[PDB]
Design an enzyme around this catalytic site. Structure first.
Site, PDB file in Angstrom:
ATOM      1  N   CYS A   1       0.856  -1.172   0.000  1.00 36.59           N
ATOM      2  CA  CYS A   1       0.000   0.000   0.000  1.00 36.59           C
ATOM      3  C   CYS A   1       0.885   1.212   0.000  1.00 36.59           C
ATOM      4  CB  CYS A   1      -0.948   0.001   1.202  1.00 36.59           C
ATOM      5  SG  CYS A   1      -0.111  -0.391   2.704  1.00 36.59           S
TER       6      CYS A   1
ATOM      7  N   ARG B   1      -1.713  -1.541   5.286  1.00 39.56           N
ATOM      8  CA  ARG B   1      -2.850  -2.188   4.641  1.00 39.56           C
ATOM      9  C   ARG B   1      -2.416  -3.426   3.867  1.00 39.56           C
ATOM     10  NH1 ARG B   1      -5.057   2.710   1.309  1.00 39.56           N
ATOM     11  NH2 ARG B   1      -2.798   3.126   1.240  1.00 39.56           N
TER      12      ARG B   1
HETATM   13  C1  LIG Z   1       3.731   4.165   8.822  1.00 46.41           C
HETATM   14  N1  LIG Z   1       2.737   5.149   9.395  1.00 46.41           N
HETATM   15  C2  LIG Z   1       2.470   4.738  10.860  1.00 46.41           C
HETATM   16  C3  LIG Z   1       3.320   6.558   9.399  1.00 46.41           C
HETATM   17  C4  LIG Z   1       1.427   5.087   8.529  1.00 46.41           C
HETATM   18  C5  LIG Z   1       0.699   3.772   8.762  1.00 46.41           C
HETATM   19  C6  LIG Z   1      -0.492   3.573   7.880  1.00 46.41           C
HETATM   20  C7  LIG Z   1      -1.825   3.627   8.211  1.00 46.41           C
HETATM   21  N2  LIG Z   1      -2.616   3.390   7.084  1.00 46.41           N
HETATM   22  C8  LIG Z   1      -1.743   3.197   6.037  1.00 46.41           C
HETATM   23  N3  LIG Z   1      -0.468   3.315   6.551  1.00 46.41           N
HETATM   24  C9  LIG Z   1       0.453   6.331   8.912  1.00 46.41           C
HETATM   25  O1  LIG Z   1      -0.061   6.360   9.998  1.00 46.41           O
HETATM   26  O2  LIG Z   1       0.356   7.122   7.932  1.00 46.41           O
END
Ligand SMILES: C[N+](C)(C)[C@@H](Cc1cnc[nH]1)C(=O)O
Ligand SMILES: [Ca+2]
Ligand SMILES: [Cl-]
Ligand SMILES: [Cl-]
Ligand SMILES: [Mg+2]
Ligand SMILES: [Zn+2]
Length: 431
Positions: free
Chosen positions: A387, A392
Site C-alpha cells: 500500500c 494495509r
Molecule cells: C507508517 N505510518 C504509521 C506513518 C502510517 C501507517 C499507515 C496507516 N494506514 C496506512 N499506513 C500512517 O499512519 O500514515
C-alpha cells in the site's frame, strides 16, 4: 397458509443436503464469524460452516445498515433463504428480519449441531489457518489460565498496538496487556521494518521471545484524515502490521484478535486502565529474520512485475490508485506502480472497508477469495501485497495467509519507497 413474520418453516437435513448445489438457495450462518471460520465454540468435533454457506452473524442485527450488508452480500429476495446456527432459536430474530424486508422464502435449519457437525458425510468448510485469528473468548481463557483449544504453549503475551498514541492503550485495554508503539518495529525514515538487530532488542525489551505466543490487537478510534496522525486511530491495522513484522522476525506463534479491541468489549469482558510495566526477556531465542520470504523489497518487487508467476497487489483506495490523492500528508507524489494488480482496500488509507465487516472483523474469506480470483489474485502465484507504507498490505497479506496460501508476501516499501525515487516509472489517472 399465510406469511408469518414470527413462525418459520423448518427445512430437514435431507432437504438441505439435496440443495447444496442450488444456485437460488442461500445458506446463512448466523453464528459468530469466528465459529464460521472454524472455531469450535460449543465444543463441536468439526468446526466451520456448511459448505457453500455465507456468514451473517446475528450480532449484526443491531446494525442500522443491516439491510445494506445483506444486499451487498447479493442475498436477494428471490433467493431461498436457509438459516442455521448452533440452535434454531438463535435464528428466530434473523428469520423475522428477513421477512420484514420483503424476503418471502425463509427457512430455518434446526440440525446443524450436533447432527450436521457430528457426521463426516455432511460437507463442511473452514478457514484453513483459522487458529491464527482468535475470538475474544479464546483470549479471555488464555489470560485466565484456562484450558483453551488451539493452544499448547506455556508462555504468552497480549500486546496492544498503536502508532504514537499511548492513550489508545491507557484509555482501556485487555487486562494484563502491554502496549507496543508501531515505531518499536518500523523506522520513521523508511516506514519499513527495522533491521534485525533493532527487532531483536525491541522484542526483548517488550518481553517477547521466539517461543512466546503473541496475541496482537488494536483499537479503532475513527481515524480522521484531517488529523496530523490519523494512523494513531487505526490501531487494529497497526496490530496486523506488527503481526506481519513479528512473523517475519521469527515469532513462531502470532495470533490476531479478530475485530480488535471492539470484539473484547462486545463480548462484555472486563477492561483495564493500568499502565502495565514491561517484563523484559534477555534473549529472543532465534535468528532474525527467521521468515524473510514474508518480506519483499523493491528490487524483488520489480522482478515480480516482470515474472509470469508473480504479481504485486496494490492494496490502496481508488483515489490513490488514479492519482487523485497521495493518501498521506507526508507523501507528495500521486500515482500508482505500473503493472500491479489493483485490489481496492477502502475509502482512504486508514480504513479497510473492503476487507472488514462493520465490527472490524475480517470480511467473509470466501468473498475476499472470489473478488481476488476475478483479478487473477490466486494462490498459485507469488504475491507481494503493498500500500502506502505496508500497513494495509500487511492486513491483506494476513487474510491470504489465513487461507493457507503458500507464497504471499508484503512489499514493504510500497508507494512511499517507490515514489521517493524519481527514476521509478508511475502511472496516473483512470486506466
Ligand atoms: C507508517 N505510518 C504509521 C506513518 C502510517 C501507517 C499507515 C496507516 N494506514 C496506512 N499506513 C500512517 O499512519 O500514515
Ligand atoms: Ca499503486
Ligand atoms: Cl483499525
Ligand atoms: Cl490501539
Ligand atoms: Mg514500508
Ligand atoms: Zn446455494
Amino acid at each position: 397458509k399465510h406469511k408469518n413474520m414470527y413462525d418459520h418453516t423448518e427445512i430437514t437435513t435431507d432437504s438441505l443436503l439435496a440443495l447444496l448445489g442450488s444456485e437460488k438457495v442461500k445458506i446463512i450462518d448466523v453464528r459468530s464469524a469466528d465459529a464460521y471460520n472454524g472455531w469450535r465454540m460449543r465444543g463441536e468435533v468439526r468446526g466451520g460452516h456448511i459448505k457453500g454457506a455465507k456468514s451473517l452473524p446475528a450480532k449484526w442485527l443491531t446494525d442500522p445498515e443491516w439491510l445494506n450488508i445483506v444486499r451487498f452480500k447479493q442475498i436477494r429476495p428471490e433467493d431461498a433463504i436457509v438459516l442455521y446456527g448452533y440452535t434454531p432459536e438463535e435464528c428466530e430474530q434473523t428469520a423475522t428480519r428477513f421477512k420484514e424486508n420483503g424476503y418471502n422464502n425463509v427457512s430455518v435449519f434446526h440440525r446443524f449441531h450436533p447432527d450436521w457437525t457430528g457426521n463426516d458425510a455432511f460437507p463442511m468448510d473452514r478457514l484453513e489457518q483459522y487458529n491464527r485469528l482468535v475470538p475474544a473468548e479464546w483470549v479471555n481463557g488464555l489470560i485466565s489460565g484456562e484450558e483453551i483449544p488451539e493452544y499448547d504453549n506455556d508462555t504468552f503475551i497480549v500486546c496492544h498496538a498503536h502508532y504514537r498514541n499511548r492513550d489508545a492503550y491507557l484509555s482501556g485495554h485487555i487486562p494484563g496487556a502491554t502496549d507496543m508503539d508501531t515505531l518499536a518495529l518500523e523506522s520513521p525514515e523508511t516506514w519499513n521494518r527495522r533491521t534485525p538487530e533493532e527487532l531483536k532488542k525491541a522484542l526483548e525489551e517488550h518481553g517477547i521471545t521466539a517461543s512466546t505466543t503473541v496475541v496482537l490487537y488494536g483499537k479503532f478510534m475513527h481515524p480522521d484524515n484531517a488529523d496530523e496522525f490519523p494512523g494513531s486511530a487505526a490501531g487494529h491495522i497497526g496490530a496486523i502490521r506488527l503481526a506481519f513484522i513479528m512473523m517475519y522476525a521469527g515469532v513462531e506463534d502470532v495470533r490476531v484478535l479478530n475485530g480488535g479491541y471492539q470484539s473484547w468489549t462486545d463480548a462484555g469482558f472486563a477492561i483495564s486502565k493500568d499502565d502495565v510495566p514491561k517484563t523484559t526477556v534477555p534473549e529472543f531465542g532465534a535468528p532474525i529474520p527467521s521468515r524473510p520470504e514474508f518480506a519483499v523489497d523493491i528490487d524483488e518487487a520489480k522482478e515480480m512485475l516482470q515474472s509470469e508467476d508473480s504479481d504485486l497487489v496494490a492494496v490502496r483506495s481508488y483515489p490513490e490508485y488514479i492519482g487523485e490523492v497521495s493518501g498521506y500528508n507526508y507523501i507528495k507524489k500521486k500515482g500508482r506502480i505500473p503493472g500491479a494488480i489493483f485490489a481496492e482496500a477502502g475509502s482512504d488509507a486508514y480504513h479497510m472497508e473492503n476487507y472488514r465487516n462493520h465490527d472490524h472483523t475480517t470480511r467473509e474469506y470466501h468473498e475476499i477469495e472470489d473478488i481476488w480470483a476475478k483479478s487473477g489474485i490466486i494462490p498459485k502465484k507469488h504475491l507481494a501485497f503493498y500500500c502506502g507504507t505496508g500497513w494495509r498490505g500487511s492486513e491483506a497479506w494476513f487474510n491470504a495467509l489465513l487461507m493457507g496460501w503458500p507464497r504471499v508476501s508484503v512489499y514493504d516499501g510500497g508507494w512511499f519507497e517507490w515514489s521517493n525515487d524519481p527514476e521509478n516509472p508511475y502511472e496516473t489517472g483512470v486506466p
